């Protein structure tokens, strides 16, 4: 039922739908080199994507149901200038009728307007005053459904967030043009990233929404914290979802030492704007290829884990012959790893997005178990354990300008 479906192909954005919308791209639109479907719009007049729909499919009805889906990534709002500044990002208003998506500090907004200037708005609000956010500077799946007899609904990552009655709106006559552009944003530093914009000529149901989410999410490729492809040879700060206010540290190099979780994390703060845990804390992990893998970490890939201590790499490993169910993990000199267990199988696991698991194996093909932690009196030591289902879920956090913390 897709009447517009925008994808990157052959050095261009095209409509895959049978309606072949014309797409005009301004000279200040940018693409991620790792994934050209990830479009970046910045706060300049020529950072524009203009989609011209065929007359045939322009929305002009009291009764026709319709839906939109897209993924968005919204950098953290840093300053008072971002408060109280609703800005359009996707505009389909003509002569004060149609629809639009807009943003504000902590908000995604859907606006419907009929030809008598009755309006209805549905809103997703997310806080920047949280230790760890599912939303800030992370890919979010947005779905908005419109049943002209009942309600407008906004879904985030397949979950219903807000719904409002719209049966009081009359004829909505939207534009033949969809303008992707930051419109009315007073912060010249603002940008968004967007991908997989779709229009549908029905009210999508919860099952169709979940299937779209799961499909476009692509559980075959692991994700970093921000929702980008997880990569080999890229340093990552580590987050244990069960103990999110702790960071990984090393208690000495070698088999007689251990890795462990230490807390609390620091805070990054601008009064009244954000108050978050520091993400750039603790010993970084680097994922190493075990094989003929390409640059992206895929579900069930076999890897080594390198740990960075004072700008030197060591190997995550254990002696699985150590008595006990929990096998305490150490940072080994790479030349000394010998016969220690070190091969890891990376697994995707997609509530909170971007969860990864790591399954340790010995050199004889035996599972030692998922990597998590175990409390030994006051110290949360990293372990591999067949006991693993809480404490064995991890996120990998690279430095990102959309998060803005100091290195």
Numbering used by the authors: 876 to 1165, 1168 to 1227, 1230 to 1267, 1277 to 1295
Sentences from the paper on this structure:
Botulinum neurotoxins (BoNT) are a group of clostridial toxins that cause the potentially fatal neuroparalytic disease botulism. BoNTs are composed of three domains—a cell-binding domain, a translocation domain, and a catalytic domain. For BoNT/A, the HC/A binds to both a ganglioside (e.g., GD1a) and synaptic vesicle protein 2 (SV2C) at the nerve terminals of the neuromuscular junction. In this paper, we present the crystal structures of the botulinum neurotoxin A2 cell binding domain, both alone and in complex with its receptor ganglioside GD1a at 1.63 and 2.10 Å, respectively.
The structure of HC/A2 was determined to a resolution of 1.63 Å by molecular replacement. It has an N-terminal β-jelly roll fold and a C-terminal β-trefoil that is consistent with other HC/A subtypes. The quality of the electron density map is good throughout except for a small loop region (Arg 1269-Phe 1277). This loop (which is conserved across all BoNT/A subtypes) precedes the ganglioside binding site (GBS) and appears to be disordered for other HC/A subtypes. In both the HC/A2 and HC/A2:GD1a structures, clear electron density was observed between Lys 1236 and Cys 1280 indicating the presence of an unusual covalent bridge between the two residues. However, it was not possible to determine the identity of the bridging atom; crystallographically, both were equally possible. Further, a recent report based on a systematic study on the presence of Lys-Cys bridges in protein structures revealed that oxygen is the most likely bridging atom; therefore, we modelled this atom in the final deposited coordinates. Although the biological relevance of this Lys 1236-O-Cys 1280 bridge in the present HC/A2 structure is currently unknown, it is interesting to note that both these equivalent residues are conserved in all subtypes of BoNT/A, and that they are situated in a dynamic region of the protein close to the GBS.
